[PDB]
Design an enzyme around this catalytic site. Structure first.
Site, PDB file in Angstrom:
ATOM      1  N   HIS A  41      -7.785  19.955  12.864  1.00  0.00           N
ATOM      2  CA  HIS A  41      -8.513  19.167  13.853  1.00  0.00           C
ATOM      3  C   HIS A  41     -10.034  19.221  13.649  1.00  0.00           C
ATOM      4  O   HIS A  41     -10.758  18.433  14.256  1.00  0.00           O
ATOM      5  CB  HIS A  41      -8.020  19.515  15.265  1.00  0.00           C
ATOM      6  N   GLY A 143     -15.770  27.312  19.883  1.00  0.00           N
ATOM      7  CA  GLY A 143     -16.197  27.818  18.597  1.00  0.00           C
ATOM      8  C   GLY A 143     -15.199  28.807  18.009  1.00  0.00           C
ATOM      9  O   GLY A 143     -15.368  29.205  16.844  1.00  0.00           O
ATOM     10  N   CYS A 145     -11.933  28.463  17.481  1.00  0.00           N
ATOM     11  CA  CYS A 145     -10.820  27.952  16.689  1.00  0.00           C
ATOM     12  C   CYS A 145     -10.885  28.471  15.249  1.00  0.00           C
ATOM     13  O   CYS A 145     -11.956  28.646  14.677  1.00  0.00           O
ATOM     14  CB  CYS A 145     -10.757  26.431  16.701  1.00  0.00           C
TER      15      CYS A 145
END
Ligand SMILES: O=C(NC[C@H]1CCCO1)NC1CCCC1
Ligand SMILES: [Cl-]
Lengths: 306, 305
Positions: A41, A143, A145
């Site tokens: 993503h 932040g 991920c």
């Protein structure tokens, strides 16, 4: 003696963490050998959030749309491909800090450590479990991920989780390192919600065995139960059913303490009925469910405090 | 969002741990520059530990009586001395993984990360608070002596704790890295008990702030209070006194949430007097006191090393 939520030492994972930027989006990647793994993503923009066509967005990227930074070094991307919901960036340098590692998919109830990271730098380590509803109760900010979950059984790092998103109830969802989601979730911003969560019964029982090993006895009783009667009661408190598999797994703790598994089940039925009556067990006034039978044996003596 | 008991990443310390053996005793050492630090009780037999004369035991020893192993590599000990209850073993090689570090003594109430180790191998990391009675509630088995505790500030590791022993109640006692005990303890096999412990009030308040930041708000109320009024209640419940410095330290959280410290103090007063009435806060049915104000700000802001 003592009993604590304990994480694995994070050092072997720390040396694998990098920063990945695509467009205006920065998150974390995991650099093993010559591959950086991150959530796919990262390649989305704002209008790609509901119904991204990942194959279509990825074919439109060149290697040089990906800025990968390991500390102060830029690593040059020389290839990219997707595997399920994970992106795999080929880079021109193998990570010299690569540990012995493997990728494992875990089942609900299992525990692991999380190294929470921002901008490719570690912030902290803690212990989690995969909930029965296939979420984890993490601590993650924007932040985070690409942060990962891991075990270290015997010098080899087993990677089991990569963080992708936060659901509306404030719990977390993500994939294995092959990019397959735990649970029914998808990497789209369409409305999704976790199923009703339940307590991990086999883990509670393990923790009660830990308490006995550490010298607690107040919650024991002279009763036993059938497996069936235990399940009928436990389910009324939103406890997971206990299978014969679970009974078998507790056999070693049973043997070390001399308390049969169905004997202990009767303690648990009583605790659910009565509460703790102002007392605590191993520093908690709740029944703890994020320690596996394996965690308990690893953390405890091989000598019971009678 | 979410909130967990979180340790500092342990990598910088993992690279400093070695195994130290003297006679039949093996335990852990900390290798920094060209010195290995460990508890002085490594040198004692069982008989010795009843009433040790460390001076006399130590002069009797020589360098080659200490076996230091860093993984598969033997370090050569070229000198030895004692500082308080710590032994310093000078070795012929500087640790190439020595981080930026200093030795710091902490105060009761402050938290730190413990890297539990066995035979020189890191085994687990967990967060602790130094209790008001100067014990820590650790998780330690035989072979864990010499494990260390630390904080990180940017790139600098502050070493604050070295594990020496377990007390009869299952709590733990140790030294700073200059060998001075935390609390009224001695390194000998004799009868010792921890004083009665108290609750770390400022830390409970910080945790209530963490709860609010994470949407857990049921315990908030319309009331406020005074330091004097609160402290009179708290002292009654074996809660440490709340000082003005404590209030100032919570200022960031009071401003971020819109709950003033004395507003939150009024909530905590009621919890003490009345209990939680069947509820939980951040998944706990107890009032948690092992998170400092600094801990909460850090975790909820995302500070990195
Ligand atoms: O059978 C396991 N998990 C799946 C069960 C738990 C909730 C309902 O389904 N075992 C886990 C616990 C011990 C380590 C892994
Ligand atoms: Cl599993």
């Amino acid at each position: 003696s003592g009993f604590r939520k304990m994480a694995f030492p994070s050092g072997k994972v720390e040396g694998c963490m990098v920063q990945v930027t695509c467009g205006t989006t920065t998150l974390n990647g995991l650099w093993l050998d010559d591959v950086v793994y991150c959530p796919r993503h990262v390649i989305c923009t704002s209008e790609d959030m509901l119904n991204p066509n990942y194959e279509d967005l990825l074919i439109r990227k060149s290697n040089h749309n990906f800025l990968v930074q390991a500390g102060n070094v830029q690593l040059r991307v020389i290839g990219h491909s997707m595997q399920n919901c994970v992106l795999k960036l080929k880079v021109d340098t193998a990570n010299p800090k690569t540990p012995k590692y493997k990728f494992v998919r875990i089942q609900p109830g299992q525990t692991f450590s999380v190294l929470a990271c921002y901008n490719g730098s570690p912030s902290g380590v803690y212990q989690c479990a995969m909930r029965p509803n296939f979420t984890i109760k993490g601590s993650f900010l924007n932040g985070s991920c690409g942060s990962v979950g891991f075990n270290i059984d015997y010098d080899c790092v087993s990677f089991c989780y990569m963080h992708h998103m936060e659901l509306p109830t404030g719990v977390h969802a993500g994939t294995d390192l092959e990019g397959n989601f735990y649970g029914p979730f998808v990497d789209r911003q369409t409305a999704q919600a976790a199923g009703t969560d339940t307590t991990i019964t086999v883990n509670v029982l393990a923790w009660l065995y830990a308490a006995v090993i550490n010298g607690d006895r107040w919650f024991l009783n002279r009763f036993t139960t059938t497996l069936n009667d235990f399940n009928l009661v436990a389910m009324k408190y939103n406890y997971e059913p206990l299978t014969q598999d679970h009974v078998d797994i507790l056999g070693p703790l049973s043997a070390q303490t001399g308390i049969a598994v169905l004997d202990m089940c009767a303690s648990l039925k009583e605790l659910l009925q009565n509460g703790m009556n102002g007392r605590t067990i191993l520093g908690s006034a709740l029944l703890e469910d994020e320690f596996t039978p394996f965690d308990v044996v690893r953390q405890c003596s091989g000598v019971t405090f009678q």
